[PDB]
Write a sequence for this structure.
């Protein structure tokens, strides 16, 4: 669920270097195949193989 | 469910005889070709995910009219059914690959398919596009053993020639 | 109004200020359809050609053509009044009638007065002035966000596919105007420009046929509340 | 173009009779609840761009094959025409809320839409899904239950009117299918 | 055994060995060899005798017919006819049974469906009465049925279970009463035997029965018969009705449960080991606290009609008495 | 059991939707019909004994097979069974007339009635003739304008007739 | 296997008299209502593919555990036997629409169907659901209120006949449960 | 070849009797509905070319991927086979329309079609697109008698429901 309600991280107050942005795949063709299933875009990312289990039960 | 041992047991059963040396030679050949079949089964259960992913991606890479309108799949749900059906197919190729006859692939996948693909407006040529992509994709002596490759190609060809 | 196909696919308007001969020719094809005029008819229209080589009142050019016996002969003498009014819309405005009321308006302006008042009625429409003015040759317009959807369907169906020539064909919009049913999807589909993916709707199949919208069919609607579904009828 | 008044008059026209009691009684119920209809149309209008944005963005995110190469949202021009159409649909639904009768929505926009989206190759599944998203978002704004905006109005029950607006959206989504 | 495993219900219904097919693909004459024909010939005995036993000495009966099948004389249609007319097939199936049972067997042997309605019985009984035994058997074989389904070169098979024959739902269930899976022969099951006519009230009135799959316990029910009331005077005791009218429906839909093996040793009242009424051995129930010699369950196989809300309790009661459930059908 | 209302609620829960406004309008309509409905049920419940008796007289008069020795209604016991069965049929048609749904009449009486009358040797068509007679007498009794406010009751007699026709259809 | 004629004749045979006036009068109403029944059977027969397809596909979409592995429809062949069964049910319903009496449907297909589907493992609820979808779609085609096919016939009243067809479908759906 | 008179003659022949008054009433209904059937046959033989032209044009209007590459219709010859096939179909609709039963349409067009369109990689959905175009686009009052239009639509619906 993890949702903060009253919450804003400014990301303009940070020092000029320390805003880093990373894209999993830097391509057009591989972010979306012709068919619907996707591992990045849409709700289709929900249906990747793996990640079905959970490791937070250690608490 | 057809295999070596079910064909020979069912054949001698239809005869009315105990199993002579002929059936024993047949199951001897089963346990000769076994290692190549099970190697192919190990690698198929290894990377089934990426095989089905490349299969459907190339299937809509060929035919784009699938999402054109009602024909084929124009929604995320139908494409989910697409990748699920190719999951079933590779799972039956794994099963027939373990059994070593085309029995579970025939009775579960092939038998009475035509009424279903016909009635539910499913084109078979797109299935064949998926399988002929995966047929071509495997590289001889790059992963599985050369005979295992032969075993896998044979089974997949059976799927294609049974489809259309 | 985005106007999706206005400049991307459809060729640009033939404005006046370029060479006169191209304006004259393009107005022949638009005012006429693919008429394919010959030597006699071009000699017969020479005085309008003179008036438009002189001053570029292409509005007055179109008026002068539609008043001439070459246009009157074919369309007002071989052709029946239903098709006459409809073609008149197509030749002058580029577009079809959007409703039965407007078709009744044009027919009424005919029957009260005559032919010339009708022609001056098309040429003096404010809609015609905003689309074309005195200086731009008539053409088919892709506005987007039209007043009626039927305006788009009938307009495209009556703007034929490249190589049109209404001299063979018979009137497709009379039952369509009076009934309010929009034309066949195939004729609409044939007339669209290239790259519009002509008629890749028409969901046909074992499942999801839904080939003809049916007015009388009852209306159903389902929404999902956390309890379950509300169907509103 | 017929409002609720013209519907009562046209129906009474067929029998060639005066308005009478009962039809005028239902029309009295129309007039009394007019402010609720007024503020309802104000709610759907004063958020409308944002409804169209959220609905079409949701239509793409539910079905990511539209933005896939080959889909009907794949280009900028196709996407512009897409946003344009959603805006038009919400416009005529707003007209149908002011009128109280769906004659305007039937004569302007709905008549010859299936044939148009057949002619252009537009997908039915995408069209009805986006309409349904505008339906739910619109009724959520009309009950003042939006999770992003809660504007101040006088309290009152408005079940009827929300069912009416849901009936117009179901008319559009049923019309494209 | 069951339904869900193997994605095929019909294997597990006991029709596992009836899927194999035999046709003579060999045209002309067989000289020297005699493997393939002896296989087909064996399947003809397995079909027409329905797995009945033929001794080596008996094989000398029908040896002429057998030596004419091997030649170009008889198609297997006509060889099947020749096996059907001979003294064997008369002794087993015709002479032992009343005329009606004989008919139903002749469909199990020749056509492999059951009769569905009384009229099929009308046709065949009529032909027998007008013309006798040979015309009876011809009236099975000399019809558009056999010719269409088998085409004269293929040995008969059980098709009554199959959807393709129009039949009746009744004839499907009746189909499983007549065929009990591989081992059961013509007289192997009860409900056929020699003097029994198998299903008569069922086959005549097209009462669809129920299916008990063979095995998995409760394999035998052989449910008790009912009479018809004051007219055609009957005993009302023995069976629950197939119908369940109103007044008891309240409390859920009615289910007919058939319990199969009921016996004294099995019946314990829920607690293991047999109850001893007196200190020393008197194991029957004390009637009025005085010793009785009447068994607790008096016929094996009593039925229960039970509404839904009472199912659980009844489901417990059966298993208290160690009875085993044959089948449960909603009624 | 199902009553107009129960059937609509039961279907609406079997899909798990709420009731649309359309359904609620229909419900309200049937209620507004409901006084007349109770009037028809009152008529039938009153004169029921004469319906069964007279209809049995006409049954045995048109078919004098059953009263003779060896016929099916020949014994004191079997006669009583015969009359009582007619009273059963008339009872459930009165029930289904109240409920507005034909479910009670099917589930309690008609569904499986033929299996019984096969199983007993009873001629089914003779029962059907008897139910046709109860239909004639009951409708002609239902359309009597005695003691009651005037209006239109054609739809309710239509419905009632449908129930009896279903009874004679289910024995035959 | 008897229609309306055979029903009247057999009932008048047990009554042991001549046919008579009242029976013939009701049968005259049947024959005068003949062509409506003709066109009705035409509608249901010339929409067989859609009725079976949509019905069973709706049965799967309502209850998606049929298609899950271990369901009746999981096997490919099972799906084919499923579609065949839907087709046959629709077929005998069309026969009962011709005959005017359900004797054909009761004696042929309805008799022992429940116990067959019990013995094979078929869930009764899914089938009841499929028969109900065939009912609603079939009455919508018989009343020309289908949402994608609108054929021209002369207008009239066929409410009686719709209730008749719905009675046969309710007979089937009540017969499997 | 199924018609009214072949069904009743074959039925009484399977009975073993002379044709009674029931068969005579059946052929009486044949000669009642005859005039509407033959009217529809006259108009179909009138404009078959424009009907097949609109049918194929809409069939490739709906489907465009037939034209590219491996798929049928790519070359001019295959598209000529396409309009030839639709010529056969309208000619069989004319034949069954004259006969009045679905006999010649069934035995000449439908019987064993599925192995042929399945084996030769021919999609049936395109055929259905052609026929549903010729089904949707007609007016009973305008170009045919009221009964005839019904008969034509019925026959064409039979084709569609027999196809997929
Ligand atoms: C191709 C056949 C067809 C044409 C043509 C047409 O206009 N519509 C169909 C027939 C049709 N179907 C219904 C009714 C329902 N159909 C379904 C099945 C679908 N609903 C689903 O959720 C799914 C799975 C995603 C499917 C396949 C359902 C559930 C109904 C409503 C059932 C009910 O209880 O009412 C109708 C009648 C409605 C209408 O369109 O007017 C028709 C004509
Ligand atoms: C054991 C093996 C096995 C299979 C091989 C599948 C085959 C299969 N697919 C579907 C069903 C389906 N299959 C597809 C798939 C397609 N979508 C398209 O765009 C393409 C043409 C194609 C993928 C290449 C779709 C879309 C459906 C749903 C069709 C519909 O409901 O319209 C169904 C009907 C039941 C269902 O809806 O799931 C079946 C039996 N099922 C099995 O049990
Ligand atoms: C279970 C069966 C199964 C297969 C059959 C393979 C098929 C397969 N091959 C590759 C992937 C690959 N396969 C090849 C092979 C080729 N090199 C060439 O020069 C030839 C054209 C061809 C051998 C004949 C190459 C080179 C890659 C890597 C491609 C790349 O990263 O560019 C991938 C993507 C994942 C990966 O990078 O490994 C997959 C799924 N994988 C499986 O799980
Ligand atoms: C309805 C009546 C009517 C007319 C009477 C004419 C009059 C006329 N002539 C010209 C136009 C012209 N007229 C002439 C004629 C001439 N060449 C010479 O050597 C001589 C002096 C003279 C013939 C005696 C020429 C040459 C032009 C073209 C002038 C140019 O473009 O330079 C124009 C301008 C438009 C055009 O270019 O055609 C007009 C209006 N037009 C009409 O509509
Ligand atoms: C008066 C009412 C009225 C309407 C309702 C619209 C309807 C409409 N939309 C388009 C045209 C269009 N409409 C869309 C919309 C879509 N994009 C998608 O991804 C979805 C399926 C869908 C939004 C839900 C698109 C993309 C086009 C352009 C299609 C194309 O050029 O390929 C056109 C053709 C002219 C044009 O290009 O603008 C028309 C008439 N226009 C009107 O005048
Ligand atoms: C020109 C534009 C224009 C508007 C947009 C409205 C806005 C508006 N609404 C009300 C007044 C009202 N508006 C509503 C409406 C509501 N009922 C509820 O349950 C919901 C929260 C909400 C509908 C979504 C109600 C109930 C009142 C009366 C409030 C009261 O008297 O308690 C009033 C005060 C005058 C009156 O009582 O009518 C005004 C100005 N009027 C206008 O002139
Ligand atoms: C809850 C609903 C309900 C019913 C509708 C009845 C139906 C019914 N009737 C009978 C039984 C009977 N029903 C009749 C009736 C008939 N006599 C004839 O001449 C006519 C054909 C017919 C009246 C029209 C007769 C005669 C019997 C006794 C049959 C016999 O014993 O021979 C029985 C068997 C038990 C018994 O003997 O009573 C049952 C279940 N019972 C119920 O519980
Ligand atoms: C508790 C018992 C009980 C009853 C027995 C009824 C009796 C009854 N019936 C009506 C009312 C009515 N009853 C009928 C019935 C008739 N239509 C005819 O053609 C026939 C003569 C007759 C059926 C045999 C009609 C038509 C009305 C409405 C009369 C009218 O409004 O004109 C009313 C007045 C209220 C109303 O309109 O419903 C009452 C009290 N109501 C009860 O509460
Ligand atoms: C051999 C095949 C065959 C058919 C299929 C029918 C088709 C048919 N129906 C009608 C005629 C008719 N058909 C209907 C039927 C309808 N009522 C409605 O509410 C629905 C739209 C529709 C049922 C689904 C009606 C109402 C008429 C009479 C129309 C009228 O007179 O207004 C007629 C004209 C002659 C007549 O009046 O009977 C014909 C030829 N007749 C045949 O011979
Ligand atoms: C004359 C009438 C008549 C009928 C009504 C059917 C009834 C019927 N269905 C099946 C057989 C079948 N019926 C179905 C149907 C089902 N699939 C499901 O997912 C659902 C529960 C259900 C559709 C609603 C299936 C799947 C089979 C095959 C079962 C199996 O082999 O496992 C069989 C056994 C023979 C066969 O395999 O075809 C029969 C008799 N047959 C007839 O002759
Ligand atoms: C008596 C009735 C009758 C028919 C209905 C046809 C049906 C038919 N078509 C083909 C054969 C063919 N049919 C087509 C037609 C198609 N091209 C496409 O792009 C579309 C999918 C489709 C038109 C809508 C094509 C292309 C072939 C040749 C296929 C090939 O050789 O690859 C063949 C095989 C023999 C041949 O090559 O001609 C047959 C039997 N023939 C008959 O005798
Ligand atoms: C043998 C059977 C047979 C048919 C059934 C028709 C079917 C048919 N109609 C048209 C053609 C046509 N059909 C119509 C009819 C319509 N007008 C409308 O308002 C309604 C939607 C509809 C009447 C209900 C129209 C208007 C055309 C001309 C379309 C056009 O040119 O735009 C054409 C193309 C050739 C032509 O222009 O005539 C054909 C093949 N022709 C045949 O040979
Ligand atoms: C990832 C692809 C994706 C989207 C895009 C969204 C789109 C979306 N918005 C919804 C519904 C929705 N959307 C809004 C409008 C929106 N919210 C606000 O508070 C403001 C200011 C808005 C415009 C900026 C509202 C008000 C609702 C109603 C729910 C709510 O209370 O927030 C719903 C629910 C539909 C329903 O109830 O049937 C969806 C699916 N969902 C997705 O999965």
């Amino acid at each position: 669920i993890a949702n903060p309600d009253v919450s804003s991280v400014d990301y303009q107050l940070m020092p000029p270097g320390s805003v880093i942005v990373q894209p999993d795949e830097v391509s057009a063709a591989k972010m979306l195949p012709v068919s619907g299933m996707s591992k990045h875009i849409g709700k289709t990312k929900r249906l990747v193989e793996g990640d079905g289990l959970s490791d937070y039960s250690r608490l | 469910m057809k295999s070596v041992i079910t064909t020979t047991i069912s054949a001698a059963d239809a005869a009315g005889r105990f199993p002579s040396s002929s059936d024993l030679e047949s199951i001897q050949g089963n346990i000769q070709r076994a290692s190549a079949r099970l190697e192919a089964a190990e690698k198929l259960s290894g990377n089934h995910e990426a095989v089905v992913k490349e299969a459907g991606d190339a299937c809509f890479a060929k035919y784009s009219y699938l999402k054109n309108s009602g024909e084929a799949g124009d929604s995320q749900e139908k494409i989910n059914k697409c990748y699920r059906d190719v999951d079933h197919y590779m799972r039956l190729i794994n099963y027939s690959l373990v059994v070593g006859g085309t029995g579970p692939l025939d009775e579960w996948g092939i038998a009475g398919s035509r009424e279903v693909y016909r009635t539910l407006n499913l084109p078979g040529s797109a299935y064949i596009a998926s399988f002929t992509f995966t047929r071509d994709r495997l590289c001889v002596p790059r992963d599985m053993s050369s005979q295992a490759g032969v075993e896998f190609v044979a089974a997949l060809d059976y799927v294609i020639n049974s489809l259309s | 109004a985005f106007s999706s196909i206005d400049r991307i696919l459809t060729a640009d308007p033939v404005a006046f200020p370029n060479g006169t001969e191209s304006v004259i020719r393009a107005t022949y094809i638009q005012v006429f359809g693919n008429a394919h005029v010959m030597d006699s008819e071009r000699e017969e229209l020479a005085t309008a050609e003179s008036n438009v080589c002189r001053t570029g009142n292409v509005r007055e050019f179109v008026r002068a053509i539609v008043l001439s016996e070459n246009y009157k002969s074919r369309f007002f003498y071989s052709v029946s009044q239903y098709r006459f009014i409809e073609l008149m819309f197509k030749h002058i405005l580029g577009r079809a009638p959007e409703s039965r009321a407007e078709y009744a308006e044009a027919m009424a302006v005919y029957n009260t007065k005559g032919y010339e008042p009708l022609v001056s009625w098309f040429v003096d429409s404010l809609e015609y002035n905003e689309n074309f003015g005195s200086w731009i040759v008539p053409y088919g317009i892709y506005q987007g966000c039209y007043s009626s959807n039927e305006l788009f369907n009938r307009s495209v169906a009556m703007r034929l596919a490249p190589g049109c020539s209404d001299k063979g064909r018979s009137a497709m919009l009379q039952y369509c105007v009076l009934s309010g049913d929009s034309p066949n999807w195939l004729s609409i589909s044939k007339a669209l420009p290239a790259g519009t993916e002509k008629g890749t709707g028409l969901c046909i199949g074992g499942h999801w046929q839904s080939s003809q919208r049916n007015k009388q069919a009852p209306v159903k609607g389902k929404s999902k509340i956390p309890g379950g579904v509300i169907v509103t009828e | 173009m017929l409002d609720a008044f013209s519907r009562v008059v046209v129906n009474s026209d067929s029998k060639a009779a005066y308005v009478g009691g009962s039809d005028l009684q239902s029309l009295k119920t129309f007039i009394s609840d007019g402010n609720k209809r007024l503020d309802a149309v104000n709610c759907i209008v004063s958020n409308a761009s944002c409804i169209v944005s959220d609905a079409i963005s949701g239509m793409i995110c539910e079905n990511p094959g539209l933005i896939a190469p080959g889909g009907n949202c794949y280009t900028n021009r196709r996407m512009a025409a897409c946003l344009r159409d959603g805006e038009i649909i919400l416009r005529y639904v707003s007209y149908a809320l002011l009128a109280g009768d769906s004659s305007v929505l039937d004569d302007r926009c709905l008549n010859g839409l299936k044939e148009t989206y057949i002619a252009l190759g537009v997908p039915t599944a995408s069209t009805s899904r986006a309409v349904s998203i505008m339906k739910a978002a619109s009724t959520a704004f009309i009950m003042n239950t939006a999770s992003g905006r809660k504007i101040e109005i006088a309290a009152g029950d408005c079940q009827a009117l929300q069912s009416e607006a849901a009936a117009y959206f179901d008319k559009v989504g049923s019309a494209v299918d | 055994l069951g339904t869900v495993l193997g994605n095929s219900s019909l294997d597990k219904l006991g029709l596992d060995k009836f899927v194999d097919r035999f046709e003579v693909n060999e045209a002309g004459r067989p000289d020297g060899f005699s493997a393939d024909y002896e296989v087909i010939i064996r399947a003809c005995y397995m079909q027409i005798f329905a797995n009945a036993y033929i001794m080596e000495s008996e094989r000398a009966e029908m040896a002429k017919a057998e030596s004419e099948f091997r030649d170009g004389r008889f198609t297997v249609k006509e060889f099947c006819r020749a096996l059907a007319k001979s003294y064997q097939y008369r002794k087993r199936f015709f002479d032992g049974r009343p005329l009606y049972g004989a008919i139903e067997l002749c469909f199990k042997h020749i056509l492999g469906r059951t009769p569905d309605g009384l009229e099929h019985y009308r046709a065949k009984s009529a032909v027998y009465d007008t013309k006798g035994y040979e015309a009876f058997i011809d009236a099975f074989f000399d019809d558009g049925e056999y010719d269409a389904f088998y085409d004269s070169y293929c040995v008969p098979f059980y098709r009554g279970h199959l959807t393709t024959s129009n039949l009746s739902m009744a004839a499907f269930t009746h189909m499983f009463q007549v065929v009990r899976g591989s081992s059961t022969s013509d007289k192997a099951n009860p409900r056929t035997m020699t003097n029994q006519i198998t299903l008569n009230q069922a086959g005549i009135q097209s009462i669809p029965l129920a299916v008990v799959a063979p095995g998995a316990d409760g394999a035998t029910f052989l449910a008790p018969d009912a009479s018809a009331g004051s007219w055609q005077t009957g005993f009302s005791g023995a069976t629950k009705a197939r119908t369940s009218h109103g007044s008891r429906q309240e409390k859920g839909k009615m289910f007919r449960i058939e319990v199969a093996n009921n016996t004294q040793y099995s019946a314990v009242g829920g607690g293991s080991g047999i109850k001893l009424q007196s200190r020393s051995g008197k194991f029957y129930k004390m009637r009025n606290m005085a010793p009785a010699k009447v068994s607790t369950f008096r016929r094996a196989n009593n039925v229960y009609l039970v509404p839904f809300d009472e199912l659980s309790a009844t489901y417990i009661k059966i298993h208290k008495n160690g009875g085993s459930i044959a089948s449960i059908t909603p009624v | 059991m199902l009553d107009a209302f129960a059937k609509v609620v039961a279907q609406a829960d079997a899909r798990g939707e709420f009731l649309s406004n359309k359904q609620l309008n229909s419900l309200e309509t049937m209620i507004g019909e409901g006084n007349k409905r109770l009037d028809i049920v009152n008529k039938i419940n009153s004169n029921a004994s004469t319906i069964v008796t007279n209809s049995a007289r006409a049954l045995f008069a048109e078919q004098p097979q059953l009263i003779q020795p060896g016929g099916n209604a020949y014994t004191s016991r079997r006669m009583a069974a015969c009359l009582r069965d007619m009273e059963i049929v008339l009872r459930y048609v009165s029930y289904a007339m109240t409920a507005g749904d034909s479910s009670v009449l099917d589930d309690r009486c008609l569904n499986g009635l033929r299996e019984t009358y096969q199983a007993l040797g009873t001629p089914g068509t003779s029962v059907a003739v008897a139910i046709q007679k109860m239909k004639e007498a009951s409708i002609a009794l239902a359309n009597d304008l005695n003691g009651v406010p005037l209006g239109d009751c054609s739809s309710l007699n239509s419905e009632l007739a449908v129930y009896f026709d279903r009874a004679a259809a289910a024995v035959v």
Observations:
- The interface with chain B takes residues 6-8, 17, 20, 39, 42-43 of chain E (CB under 8 Å).
- The beta strands of chain E are 254-259, 303-307, 325-330.
- The longest strand of chain E covers residues 254-259.
- The CA atoms of residues 279 and 291 of chain E lie 13 Å apart.
